[PDB]
Design a protein around this ligand. Structure first.
Ligand SMILES: O=C(O)C1=C[C@@H](O)[C@@H](O)[C@H](O)C1
Length: 498
């Protein structure tokens, strides 16, 4: 429905003068409007403070005076609360937000008294779940019947599949609709508004000033997710994982897509259940995915066709949806990225026997030295299907060999977790850690103190990523670009996108 989505910045400073500065920062960062959260002001003088904000804000203003019974801070008399919103209207507000619960009464109170530019948002907040399309439809119709100018519905993501229902609502409701799904599993709903008809999304001045769970920053919407480039035809890609908030795949693929003017967007996909995820997002809108822990093996099963390298590895880390028939094709770029990063570093000990361990184990037997796996669960086979070692024993273990961590051990926030004792590294000449967040794991740090050769996970991450770009876009992998993107935009640590 109609225009690209606006970016609204929530303004929650507890004093009038600080809110003024926040509206200025909102303007500097690129926000399109501000939501003035009046219920967050510590000492409020409505006529005075309202006049101040409207006079000084460089951006159009949306006033919200959220009561405690709708998730806000305001307590006290209800008519006084409404008096303030009407006051904001007659003082020159661009919008007010009024709760569905009181919306009929309130809109009646201003009938024939609205200024010309003024729109009334009527909102409903669901902190439990995301209702069925049938129940959302009825919600939309109820909000319309109050006389709302704009419909606002926030729901809660119990599973990421919930987001498809909200997209269906914003895409097809014939009324300007703000439709958002809260929580980390709902984050995709906040990014893709301009493709699915959303009127507005909330982006924060920074990650500390969140007004409801899941909101990204304005800067990430604009510069990381390329918000202004997203449109109805943009194809959606993403990193399927659990956890997923550490992933820098959205940073690199969005920069590459933008650099080559490819009409795609890459988001985080926090997926609990891989089967239901793929079923829920089967349309052509969702053109490909990357697959991380713990879904690499299940993805191989969910794919209709499987590349031989991935077939014979047992795991899929890249899913392409073929436009012809909607068919899911599965590839593996972990092998080449891992092995080639190690070869450039210069008997193989592979920590972990999940999808990433399978790809590295497979690759190593293919070229140079075919050797031994170590997993938490000892009995992870793979040392047989390729040519084992219980995790508790791996420290107790040649002088100048190799070791390759492919588990999540050491990944943020577990920065002091390491898969093996420092003293046991004396037996190793190269240590590779697929973990790239942080860049310097405890394992890699201690491995270097042990005088060994350290190849970081970023060497593997960038390599496997430009191979996925090639699969995703059908365009030649722009290797130099991806290194340059990772160097300039993927260097900061302790980043959580959630
Ligand atoms: O962190 C990430 O985004 C990923 C890491 C690796 O598992 C890759 O196999 C996956 O494709 C992307």
């Amino acid at each position: 429905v109609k225009n690209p989505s606006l970016i609204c910045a929530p303004v929650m400073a507890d004093s009038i003068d600080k809110m003024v500065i926040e509206t200025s920062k909102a303007h500097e960062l690129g926000a399109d409007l501000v939501e003035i959260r009046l219920d967050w002001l510590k000492d409020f003088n409505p006529l005075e403070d309202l006049k101040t904000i409207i006079k000084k804000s460089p951006l159009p203003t949306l006033f919200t005076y959220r009561p405690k019974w709708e998730g806000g801070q305001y307590e006290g008399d209800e008519n006084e609360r409404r008096d303030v919103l009407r006051l904001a209207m007659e003082l020159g507000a661009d919008y007010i937000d009024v709760e569905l619960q009181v919306a009929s009464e309130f809109i009646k109170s201003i009938d024939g008294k609205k200024p010309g530019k003024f729109k009334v948002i009527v909102s409903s907040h669901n902190y439990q779940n995301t209702p069925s399309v049938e129940d959302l439809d009825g919600l939309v119709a109820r909000i319309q019947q109050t006389g709302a100018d704009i419909v606002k519905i926030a729901t809660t993501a119990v599973d990421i599949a919930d987001v498809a229902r909200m997209f269906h609502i914003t895409s097809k409701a014939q009324v300007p609709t703000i439709g958002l799904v809260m929580g980390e599993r709902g984050l995709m709903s906040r990014i893709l508004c301009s493709k699915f008809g959303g009127y507005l999304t909330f982006g924060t001045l920074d990650s500390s000033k969140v007004s409801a769970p899941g909101q990204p920053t304005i800067k990430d919407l604009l510069d990381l997710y390329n918000f202004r480039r997203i449109g109805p035809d943009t194809k959606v890609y993403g990193i399927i994982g659990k956890p997923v908030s550490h992933s820098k795949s959205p940073i690199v693929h969005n920069q590459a897509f933008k650099s080559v003017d490819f009409n795609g967007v890459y988001v985080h996909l926090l997926v609990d259940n891989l089967v239901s995820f793929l079923q829920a997002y089967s349309s052509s809108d969702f053109a490909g995915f990357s697959c991380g822990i713990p879904h690499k093996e299940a993805a191989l099963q969910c794919c209709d066709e499987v590349d031989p390298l991935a077939k014979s590895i047992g795991a899929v880390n890249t899913i392409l949806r073929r436009k012809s028939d909607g068919k899911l094709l599965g590839y593996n770029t972990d092998c080449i990225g891992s092995i080639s990063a190690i070869e450039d570093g210069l008997t193989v000990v592979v920590i972990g026997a999940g999808g990433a361990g399978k790809a590295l184990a497979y690759g190593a037997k293919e070229k140079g030295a075919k050797v031994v796996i170590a997993n938490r669960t000892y009995e992870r086979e793979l040392a047989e299907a390729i040519g084992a070692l219980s995790l508790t024993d791996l420290d107790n273990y040649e002088d100048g060999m190799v070791l390759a961590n492919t588990t999540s051990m050491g990944m943020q926030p577990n920065v002091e977790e390491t898969p093996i004792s420092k003293d046991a590294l004396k037996h190793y000449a190269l240590v590779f850690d697929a973990v790239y967040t942080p860049r310097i794991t405890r394992l890699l740090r201690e491995a270097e103190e042990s005088g060994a050769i350290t190849v970081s996970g970023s060497e593997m991450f960038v390599r496997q990523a430009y191979e996925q770009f090639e699969i995703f876009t059908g365009l030649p992998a722009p290797k130099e670009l991806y290194w340059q993107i990772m160097s300039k935009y993927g260097s900061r640590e302790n980043l959580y996108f959630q």
